[PDB]
Each structure stands twice: as C-alpha cells, then as structure tokens.
Write a protein that binds this ligand. Sequence first.
Ligand SMILES: Cc1cc(O)c2cc(F)ccc2n1
Length: 291
Amino acid sequence: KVGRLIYTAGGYFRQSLSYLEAYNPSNGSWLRLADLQVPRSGLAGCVVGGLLYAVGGRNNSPDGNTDSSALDCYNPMTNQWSPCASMSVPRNRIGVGVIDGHIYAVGGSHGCIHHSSVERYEPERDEWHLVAPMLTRRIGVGVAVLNRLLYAVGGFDGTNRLNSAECYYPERNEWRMITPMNTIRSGAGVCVLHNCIYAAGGYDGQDQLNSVERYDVETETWTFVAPMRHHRSALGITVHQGKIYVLGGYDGHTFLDSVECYDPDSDTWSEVTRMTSGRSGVGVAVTMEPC
Ligand SMILES: Cc1cc(O)c2cc(F)ccc2n1
C-alpha cells in the first residue's frame, strides 16, 4: 500500500495545460513529471496495471480548440508518455471508469455533439470497442465503478444540466436509470468510497456547488454529507487510503489551487495541500511513485 501518489494530469487555466504533477500525502511533497504530449483539459485519468492513462479532453489554445480522441499511457518507471490506441470519437468533458482491467470511456462532447456513446479499452490488445450507449447524452459526466458496475452521474445533455444518473451492467451490456441525485450537477467530481458513489461539487446551472451527496448502491438513496470548504466545478477527484481528495476547479471567481480531503468517519473536510497553480478540468488517479 505504501509509495502511492496522487497524479494530476492536464487541466485549464487560460488555456489547456500539459502538466503532470504528483502529490505524496505521506510527506506533502509535489513532483513535476513529464508533460503530456498534447495539452488537454476536460480529460479523465485512470490506472490499470500500474500505468496511468490520460483519456480524451480538449486542447484549448490561442490557435484553436481540438477535442481529443486520445488515449496516452504514462509509465512511472520510465517517466515517459506513450500513445495508445485512440477512441472511436473525440470526447471532451469525458468520464472514465475501470472494470476488471478495462477502461470505459463515457459520454463527452465533440463540438456541439453531446455523446451518449460508450466504449471499452482492452490494454492487452490495445483496442477499443463500442458498447451499449447510455440512455442519456451526457457531457461533464461523473463516472465511477463499484462492485463491477459502472455509474454515469449528472452532466449536460445539450439542453439541460442533469440530476439523473444511470448504471451499466456489463454482463447484460445494458444501462438502467438509478435514483436521481438531489442536486443538478454538471462537472461534479464522482468517485467511490466504501459502498457509495459520491458526487461532489459541480454546477447546477446557476452556481458552482460545495455540496456533496452519496448514493448507497443497496438502499438506492442519495444523502448529503458535509459540504466542501470551497464551491467548485470541474474539479478533479480520487480516493486514497479511505479518504476522498478533491483538486482544483473553478469557484465562480478563481481557478482554485486548493486540495481538500474528506474523512468519512468524522464527516469532515480539511484542506491538505495546494497544487502548484490553480486549474480546473484535470484528470486524476493514483499509482506508484515514479523512477
Ligand atoms: C469559466 C470556465 C470554467 C472552467 O472550468 C473551464 C474549463 C475549461 F476547460 C475551459 C474553460 C473554462 N471556463
């Protein structure tokens, strides 16, 4: 269990960013690692087999906006990025989850197109294949996996921001609606901790949110927990050693550098570190320290 870092890839502040930086909760340190080959915001990160993957996003730059179909793999042992097979379609403001060593890419946008499509990556074969689409088009969608079921939470369908959520049952290749959240949220941070899917922050169509609610997959209810100290949309999120970490985002005024940590035992959030610069739209995952 020792030696794991929280990696943050990409993001946005004025333009899309190429940063890869890793935070060590055991000593408070940050390391700057190899830049992404292409700057991107609105991407997702995940880890399979100790490799970090950056999935989708968009390169917002002075000279244009390019939605990304890219899958890139970072090996901490070499501090190098390598291209992997690209997805079927560009997906900005994507959500990603891992089931049994396979990466699911969910939703996202391509220009004015809001995807319901979903595809699955097989690392051993370096291949993507489309699976059943969601019941709803969703960009800015939060995704997490619990008990080998994939959840897609909130987002924006092209007309409305969503409180709805749905679950993918892989053995049936089928999506079904679940209980909707109490709050409309696009660009929330979504993760799994114990037996619940958490949705933290986001944007409800009027304000960036500090509220946090969790879906108990047994009782099918959403319950609010303690709110974050900061309102934030387009935050990064991950779980590490039984606690939720939220990174950056936008509070309606500032691109935040603050990282908060949720302790479920005490139902409290505390500020644990700051990123080296404020940013939103990062991808986040946990794996072993590099080199
Ligand atoms: C106001 C605002 C907030 C974001 O979180 C953004 C993220 C992006 F990737 C690009 C633009 C953005 N603008």
